Amino acid sequence: NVHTNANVKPKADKSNPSHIGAQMPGSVTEVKVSVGETVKANQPLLITEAMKMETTIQAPFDGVIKQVTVNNGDTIATGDLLIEIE
């Protein structure tokens, strides 16, 4: 592509605790976890930039990251799947 800004992300299924969805339209500023990792509850796994403002996305529980749908500097839309955990 030349970067990954054209990439369409699947929508997170809302009634599945494994699926973490994008809460706002933002930009992925920093990816912090990869496929097959295990960190504690509240682990800062993704850093988005909403609109000049920055929030870390945290894990709701303990578990193993199955998929990360995004890369650094990627645009996101409300309801976009970002992370899946076990």
Partner: protein
């Protein structure tokens, strides 16, 4: 038409001649083939590409999941409210 032939009494008996078709006018009893499924894809197809009357043409917005509370038909059927009152006294 073929269904009609297959379903017909004279055909299933096995005793039928070359006259069978002409002597049975009700084989051309053909209703227009109702087609709900295709029509629905046409609508969605249309609104997706060309939008809806005075709704801001945009990506289908993100909607928060809805928990729709439910009550059993039977439970409803046991209820006696103002409707039953009306039928009761007028």
């Amino acid at each position: 038409f073929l269904i009609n032939v297959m379903k017909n009494k004279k055909f299933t008996s096995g005793d039928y001649t070359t006259k069978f078709i002409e002597e049975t006018p009700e084989l051309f009893d053909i209703q227009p083939s109702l087609d709900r499924g295709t029509k629905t894809l046409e609508y969605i197809g249309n609104v997706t590409i060309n939008g809806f009357p005075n709704v801001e043409k945009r990506p289908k917005p993100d909607y928060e999941l809805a928990s729709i509370p439910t009550v059993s038909s039977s439970k409803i059927a046991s209820f006696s409210g103002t409707k039953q009152l009306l039928d009761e006294v007028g």
